[PDB]
Design a protein around this ligand. Structure first.
Ligand SMILES: COCCO[C@H](C[C@H](O)[C@H](COc1cc(F)cc(F)c1)NC(=O)c1cc(C(=O)N[C@H](C)c2ccccc2)cc(N(C)S(C)(=O)=O)c1)C(=O)N[C@H](C(=O)NCc1ccccc1)C(C)C
Length: 373
């Protein structure tokens, strides 16, 4: 039942959202980072200074060795380990046990985060980007094949402790307001989408829309930031700077290298622009927009100052709609209908004159054009 899954995510501010899972017989409990940017399920399986527990394959009677090594690189770090299968279940998830591929992590480099409270990663994207190749069936594909869990999940990430929900197999309408707006999944590898327009405080960034999606645009729960191609990042930083040029920010602030601080309760939110991303819609010449507030992209780093990191950053690998974007929203990963839905979440943060929004319909032409090939 869906209420069972409401509030099944936890985390620490800026350290990742995780769901509880059990691997093996008898069940070993682990906290697993929810990652829509990858397709491998992997767990700490050897001692590590940042780990408080790990998978113990020797203690599981249902463990099978696949007798294959694996390496998974990401933007932020990488791990290697050994491939196996085992029985997996999600306590605040559907009432099922599946046999799934699990990579036992045996070494890693800048992967685990000290104090984050998670010991593994659930990659929820498609087999096309699984390591070492697309025949290593991802967890969610195993789940759907082996149970009657519908081929859909949703993510409500509640930011600024963190919490939220991963609704497995469905949409929980008590968790958002207004209507869901859907964008096509362009290709089933990452959750790839097409951005057709960008506005900052209502002013069109006016770039060729190909720039927004060079060389892809994805929805990624495992990445903190809004990550933007170089040209777009520069255009956007230039606008955000102009809008806030009432105030003094070291150039390292704009690079996420340094924090800005304000006497508690005096953050000048009004001087930071809203950002609207327009997404390709479901119908011919249809688009919709999602609007994010400064509070999403100025992330509080916890002295009686309020201090913040700038959480829009540059990318050489396309646009990444990270938790910065997703925190405003209820996000439906509707794999069965090849689409991603956005609605404003019931847990949206509160500006007192401005609102995170999902609005449509808009008309926009040759959204063809925006796709990078
Ligand atoms: C490249 O296009 C974008 C796709 O990016 C995904 C990122 C993926 O979501 C991984 C998943 O989670 C990890 C978390 C970690 F702590 C350490 C990790 F190593 C991974 N995430 C990140 O790489 C990542 C994580 C974080 C990060 O801090 N995550 C924490 C857990 C967090 C905090 C709050 C909210 C949500 C998450 C930050 C960043 N940034 C760069 S940043 C500063 O925000 O701009 C990136 C990814 O890298 N996927 C892999 C990939 O594409 N690899 C190819 C590759 C090879 C070599 C180099 C780079 C890429 C594969 C396996 C599908």
């Amino acid at each position: 039942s869906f209420v069972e899954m409401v509030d099944n995510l936890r985390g620490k501010s800026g350290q990742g959202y995780y769901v509880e899972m059990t691997v093996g017989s008898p069940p070993q409990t682990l906290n697993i980072l929810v990652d829509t940017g990858s397709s491998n399920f992997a767990v700490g399986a050897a001692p590590h200074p940042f780990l408080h527990r790990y998978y113990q394959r020797q203690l599981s009677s249902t463990y099978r060795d696949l007798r294959k090594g694996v390496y998974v690189p990401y933007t932020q770090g990488k791990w290697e380990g050994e491939l196996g299968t085992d029985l997996v279940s999600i306590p605040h998830g559907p009432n099922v046990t599946v046999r799934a591929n699990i990579a036992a992590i045996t070494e890693s480099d800048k992967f685990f985060i000290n104090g984050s409270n998670w010991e593994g990663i659930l990659g929820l994207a498609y087999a096309e980007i699984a390591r070492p190749d697309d025949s290593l069936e991802p967890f969610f594909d195993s789940l759907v094949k082996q149970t009657h869990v519908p081929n859909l999940f949703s993510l409500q990430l509640c930011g600024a402790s963190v919490g939220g929900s991963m609704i497995i197999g469905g949409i929980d309408h008590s968790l958002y307001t207004g209507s869901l707006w859907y964008t096509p999944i362009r290709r089933e590898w990452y959750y790839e989408v097409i951005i057709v327009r960008v506005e900052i405080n209502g002013q069109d960034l006016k770039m060729d829309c190909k720039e927004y999606n060079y060389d892809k645009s994805i929805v990624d729960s495992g990445t903190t930031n809004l990550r933007l191609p170089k040209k777009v990042f520069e255009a956007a930083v230039k606008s955000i700077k102009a809008a806030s040029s009432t105030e003094k920010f070291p150039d390292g602030f704009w690079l996420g290298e340094q924090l800005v601080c304000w006497q508690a309760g005096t953050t000048p939110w009004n001087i930071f622009p809203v950002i609207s991303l327009y997404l390709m819609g479901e119908v011919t010449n249809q688009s919709f927009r999602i609007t994010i507030l400064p509070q999403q992209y100025l992330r509080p780093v916890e002295s009686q100052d309020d201090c913040y990191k700038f959480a829009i950053s540059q990318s050489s690998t396309g646009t990444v709609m990270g938790a910065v974007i997703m925190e405003g929203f209820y996000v439906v990963f509707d794999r069965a209908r090849k689409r991603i839905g956005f609605a404003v979440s019931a847990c949206h943060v509160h500006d007192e004159f401005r609102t995170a929004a999902v609005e449509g319909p808009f008309v926009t032409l040759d959204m063809e054009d925006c796709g990078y090939n």
